Structure 1
Amino acid sequence: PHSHPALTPEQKKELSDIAHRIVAPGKGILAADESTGSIAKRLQSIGTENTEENRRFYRQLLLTADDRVNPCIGGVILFHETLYQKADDGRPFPQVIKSKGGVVGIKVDKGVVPLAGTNGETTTQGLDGLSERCAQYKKDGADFAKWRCVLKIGEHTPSALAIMENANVLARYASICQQNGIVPIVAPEILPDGDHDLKRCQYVTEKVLAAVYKALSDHHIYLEGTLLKPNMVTPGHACTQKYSHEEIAMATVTALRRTVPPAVTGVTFLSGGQSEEEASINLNAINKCPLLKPWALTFSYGRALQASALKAWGGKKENLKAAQEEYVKRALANSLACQGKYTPSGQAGAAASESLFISNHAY
């Protein structure tokens, strides 16, 4: 085929600049774009209600930390509502993140819907009018975006149709984003559920990353103006055989090494149902693995960067300072891990009180 410049060289420069500012060495992303119902679950768990004012409050907390976290966070992923929310001193949240030293992010997908004739599979929707939302959002104060899809490993899942769909739908969204100066973060989230061991996870991950990078090539997306946010190679949470961080490190680096091109600027690992300490330890391990790593390997933790701070606040407005402090600490730990310079804090077991959910309820 032959030439048809989708983006101008000027636009290309913009995307590269931004995509590169986010994944700077030592920085990572804080994912605080949880939807209304989702976050409602968090407030219920402690003893707090889920009101507008409260939401505005909790957010303001993580967002008002001291400048220790400044060289640690390259970006934050906000929820639509939060975008137009003001601080106590009247400062708009988007601007307040700017003052710290990071870029504004915004979730844009409109939830997953089911696929007919598949063993409980889904694809994500939300393309209708996307470009308009992006032009407006760029104007309002956001620079990049996050779009998620959900795949699961099982007997004979994911399906050819599922990997096919999501990978093309992700490329589709990506194209739109760039035409509006928005760096797209592609998130091919695989479920850590099941009795599949580590081997099966690595196998599934590769074939996915292959499917996603081909779809993007066909779609003419500017790789340098993108980011990848995948799951680490890990067995099902119900799996029997335990593995070491070294094995978890090797497996993850290997799959990416065989599927992610060096044009890609960064791989931002999500939390993935892991506790705070595990997340950090795995991040450090991945950045220690003796293999050639051309792209920055950082994090994009949601609750993995919160947990403590959450129950620290506990609704009790007076518990503010202590909470914020806990979170700041978790930020430093990660800043160190993404650069292979972190060391464990404690080998006891203060991690997750709802870990494997199959035996006797959850929400």
Structure 2
Amino acid sequence: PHSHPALTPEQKKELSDIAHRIVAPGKGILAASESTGSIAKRLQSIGTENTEENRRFYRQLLLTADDRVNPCIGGVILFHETLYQKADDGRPFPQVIKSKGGVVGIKVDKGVVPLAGTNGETTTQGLDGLSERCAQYKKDGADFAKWRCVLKIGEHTPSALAIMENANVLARYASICQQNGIVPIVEPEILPDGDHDLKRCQYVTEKVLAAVYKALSDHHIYLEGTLLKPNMVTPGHACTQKYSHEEIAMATVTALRRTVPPAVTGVTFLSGGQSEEEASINLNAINKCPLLKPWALTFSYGRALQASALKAWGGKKENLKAAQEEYVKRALANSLACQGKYTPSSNHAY
């Protein structure tokens, strides 16, 4: 085949530099790009009305936590709405994030859609006019993006079609992002839903990631200018057999070692509904795994970083401080976790 440089040396350096800053040692990502529809249940759990002002207040609360979170947060992913909101002092949220040493990210997909002929499987949309949207987001402060694809482990899933199609759409999204100076975070999430075990999850994860990277190669994606946001390898949420954190860490690191090229700048694990402690302990175990890991292994958590903060807030302004404290606690815990320094107090079998 013949080469037709998709990117210039300058464009590569920009993308690579951004990717490295986000996952710099001890740093991780705050995934706060929930939409009105997904954050609705969050707020209703604390009897708080889901208005634009309350969403703004809650996001301000997380974004303006004291400097203790600075060394822990390399990036913050915002939803469109939030990217254009301002703190009480009039400062745009992207500015608030940057001033704290964080890189600003933006969710760009437009949700999942049903794949006809499959057993409830989906693909993700959002490519239409994506280039122009990225150019605008870039001008408005964002340097990286989020696009979520969802795959499910079942009797006949994920199917060959679901894997191939989701891998392909992720490559398209990545290509467009890189053309506009936006570091794409590739997210092929395999849900923990089901009664499958650890080995089954490792197997599917390995097959999905191999497909993802072949697609990235086919689409001429610059890996140094990307990040990977995969599910950790864990047993199904309803799996009868139980496993230790060390087993989870081994399955996860092994799967990644067998599929993720060293060129990938970093891996930002999704929380996948895990609890704040569970997510921190597993990340720590992953970093302590005695196997060689050529990429940063950090976090990109949503509720695993917000759960306690949201609850402490309870929708009451006088609980601002108490709420931010909980967030700071999870940021500190996960910052230590991505270094294998967190303490709450035969690989051939894989």
* TM-score, length of structure 2 as denominator length: 0.98
Deviations 1:268-313 (A, max 9, x none): 0011111000000000000011101000000000000011110101
Q: Which residue of 2 aligns with 1:338?
A: 338
SS in structure 2 at match of 1:298: strand
The CA deviation at 1:360 is 39
SS in structure 2 at match of 1:243: coil
Deviations 1:201-260 (A, max 9, x none): 000000000000000001000000000000001111111011001100100000000000
Q: Which residue of 1 aligns with 2:133?
A: 133
Q: Which residue of 2 aligns with 1:192?
A: 192
% identity of equivalent residues: 99
CA distance in 2, matches of 1:224, 1:361: 30
SS in structure 1 at match of 2:214: helix
Equivalent pairs counted in the alignment come to 349
Deviations 1:148-200 (A, max 9, x none): 00000010100000000000000001000000000000001001011101110
> Contact (CA 8 Å) 2:134, 2:177: kept in 1 or not?
yes
Deviations 1:21-74 (A, max 9, x none): 000010000000001111111111111111111111000000110000001100
The CA deviation at 1:109 is 0.2
The CA deviation at 1:361 is 41
Q: Which residue of 1 aligns with 2:317?
A: 317
CA distance in 2, matches of 1:72, 1:361: 34
SS in structure 1 at match of 2:149: strand
SS in structure 2 at match of 1:44: helix
CA distance in 1, matches of 2:28, 2:245: 20
CA distance in 2, matches of 1:62, 1:329: 12
CA distance in 2, matches of 1:362, 1:26: 30
CA distance in 2, matches of 1:44, 1:362: 45
For the structure 1 residues 107 and 117, does the alpha-carbon distance in structure 2 shift closer, same or farther, using more than 3 Å as the test? Answer: same
The CA deviation at 1:316 is 1.2
CA distance in 2, matches of 1:208, 1:200: 12
For the structure 1 residues 248 and 118, does the alpha-carbon distance in structure 2 shift closer, same or farther, using more than 3 Å as the test? Answer: same
> Contact (CA 8 Å) 2:308, 2:323: kept in 1 or not?
yes
SS in structure 2 at match of 1:141: coil
CA distance in 2, matches of 1:327, 1:3: 47
SS in structure 1 at match of 2:128: coil
Q: Which residue of 1 aligns with 2:154?
A: 154
SS in structure 2 at match of 1:184: strand
The CA deviation at 1:362 is 37
For the structure 1 residues 362 and 324, does the alpha-carbon distance in structure 2 shift closer, same or farther, using more than 3 Å as the test? Answer: farther
**Misfit runs of 4+, over 4 Å:** 359-363
CA distance in 1, matches of 2:216, 2:32: 27
Which structure 2 residue ranges, 5 or more long, are not aligned?
none
* TM-score, length of structure 1 as denominator length: 0.94
SS in structure 2 at match of 1:272: coil
> Contact (CA 8 Å) 2:80, 2:107: kept in 1 or not?
yes
For the structure 1 residues 230 and 174, does the alpha-carbon distance in structure 2 shift closer, same or farther, using more than 3 Å as the test? Answer: same
CA distance in 2, matches of 1:142, 1:202: 33
CA distance in 1, matches of 2:339, 2:104: 23
CA distance in 1, matches of 2:128, 2:22: 28
> Contact (CA 8 Å) 2:197, 2:235: kept in 1 or not?
yes
> Contact (CA 8 Å) 2:184, 2:226: kept in 1 or not?
yes
CA distance in 1, matches of 2:6, 2:243: 45
CA distance in 2, matches of 1:246, 1:361: 14
Deviations 1:305-354 (A, max 9, x none): 0111101010111111000011101100000010011101xxxxxxxxxx
1:85 aligns with 2:72: no
SS in structure 2 at match of 1:325: helix
1:224 aligns with 2:211: no
RMSD, aligned α-carbons: 4.5
The CA deviation at 1:3 is 1.9
Deviations 1:50-100 (A, max 9, x none): 111111100000011000000110000000000110111111100110100
Match of 1:360 among 341, 347, 350: 347
> Contact (CA 8 Å) 2:183, 2:226: kept in 1 or not?
yes
> Contact (CA 8 Å) 2:250, 2:347: kept in 1 or not?
no
Q: Which residue of 1 aligns with 2:114?
A: 114
For the structure 1 residues 361 and 257, does the alpha-carbon distance in structure 2 shift closer, same or farther, using more than 3 Å as the test? Answer: closer
